Structure of Estradiol 17-beta-dehydrogenase 1:
Amino acid sequence: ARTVVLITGCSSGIGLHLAVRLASDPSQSFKVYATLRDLKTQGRLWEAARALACPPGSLETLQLDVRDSKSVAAARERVTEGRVDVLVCNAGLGLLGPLEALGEDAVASVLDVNVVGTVRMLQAFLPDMKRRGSGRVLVTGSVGGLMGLPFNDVYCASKFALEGLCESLAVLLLPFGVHLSLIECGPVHTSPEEVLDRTDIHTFHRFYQYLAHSKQVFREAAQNPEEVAEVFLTALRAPKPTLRYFTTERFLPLLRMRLDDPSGSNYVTAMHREVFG
Amino acid sequence: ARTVVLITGCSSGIGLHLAVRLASDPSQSFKVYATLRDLKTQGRLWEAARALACPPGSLETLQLDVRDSKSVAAARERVTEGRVDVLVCNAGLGLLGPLEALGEDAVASVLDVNVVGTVRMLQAFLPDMKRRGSGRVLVTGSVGGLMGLPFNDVYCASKFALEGLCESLAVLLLPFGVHLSLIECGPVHTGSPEEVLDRTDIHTFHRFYQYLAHSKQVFREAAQNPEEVAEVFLTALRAPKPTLRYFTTERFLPLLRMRLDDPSGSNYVTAMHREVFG
Ligand SMILES: COc1cc2c(cc1O)CC[C@@H]1[C@@H]2CC[C@]2(C)[C@@H](O)[C@@H](Cc3cccc(C(N)=O)c3)C[C@@H]12
Ligand SMILES: COc1cc2c(cc1O)CC[C@@H]1[C@@H]2CC[C@]2(C)[C@@H](O)[C@@H](Cc3cccc(C(N)=O)c3)C[C@@H]12
């Protein structure tokens, strides 16, 4: 039969592009369930699917809010085939700021969505994969999950968390026939009085230095979602897929140098200089 | 003046033994605020302090629940000296089982306590350290935050989270003179099988008790004491130029190097599976 794929966060960005890219495969091997936090936002997804003339029956949309395990469960049941062959945990939020400037609500939401939401997906869907003896799981990773970056403290915390969660599972799942892969993405194309009042003069200084230098890095390094989507394909098609795929080699140098020094301090020293000019 | 230390998770283990070790230090240079989630658990802390002769005013206990930022705020207000010279973020939960067997609340708890709790600590205490231009933060870390282990998926997520949190901060804090360190602990010596089986398949049930048996042999061979771990905290406190990571044992550095050698993660997964399961 068709390979059944379920992808979260499908309304914009990487999810959309992967969803339509699989639905329009001319072998037409893929039945795609594209899931969205709000089904009302699906319009843009359907336009891109028409533009590739996705055969009807190749792409179905569901509501799936990863904060809520009832919405996760309900979505699992809407998979009328009664299996998922490829699960793509892509739903994620950002958070940028001096740590002490972030509300408690915001910090928790990032963790609730990027980490706990991924745990909910895996809890719902891994058992049937394990029963069948096969399955693929692809998780939207970050270079931020491999190296820490100033003012992304909670974001990197959630992406590092995904590394640990997915690496922990992969060790168990290898002989269950289930293959877990992280797609490590770099950047992807898609008042100040407050900051000062909630921080201090030096932190405030370093944050606008950061926002300025960061924008230069996206301009050079940012990838289009369609390019990243291809990396998911490669992983998906790989016969013996590996734990990580990098969408770019741009940060292998800083990554190798981070791994040279266990104490951590060369990474901190270098990253500081490189970020703060 | 003495060095003001505030430590979370002092009812037992690393927090209790480090707290009494510093308050009883022969220097007499430490004033320790040993904090606890529930004050009723302070029994073993006081008996230990009594046993090591902590002098008057070397040790005070505060109720502090890392889940509750008003608790954290109230604790900060009880620091009479108006500053903390060493903050130790040691409060933490374990969680051990097949991922599908763990309850959603327990999962949410580990994260709230190990990761958001630490964030709340750093929110409440880093600013004053930043504007002073001085401070040391020590965070209890794990080798489980550096490499993933089967059936420790959520615990590892949480420890990995701390690595990212702390490393992101360290890049910022370098010119402030506020030093952040992770004390990377290996095993330290301090779900009902029923519930587990219901929620997991048969092969995973077996694999888990296979993991538990190997685990108990690793703990027997290689576990450290809280007393031994507490020395590494103290070495890090005193270091003139502290590093981001202190390892309590050298034992896992080989595996860690292998993990880092192969960025694709393939080698680690094979090796760790064999290591754990044969
Ligand atoms: C050393 O090179 C640098 C890399 C970087 C910066 C600055 C540098 O000097 C700032 C952006 C950051 C990159 C490295 C790669 C990073 C970590 C990417 O994976 C990006 C992760 C990211 C993407 C979108 C939102 C967020 C967020 N809200 O925090 C975070 C942000 C990127
Ligand atoms: C590399 O060889 C091994 C190391 C290990 C094991 C099995 C191995 O084959 C199983 C236990 C584990 C050690 C490596 C270091 C580990 C991960 C330590 O950090 C321990 C962490 C730990 C302690 C207490 C509870 C929990 C938890 N999941 O709640 C986790 C548990 C240790």
Q: What stands out?
A: Chain B touches chain A through 74 residues (CB under 8 Å). The first strand of chain B starts at residue 3 and ends at 7. The first helix of chain B runs from residue 13 to 23. The two ends of chain B are 55 Å apart (CA to CA).
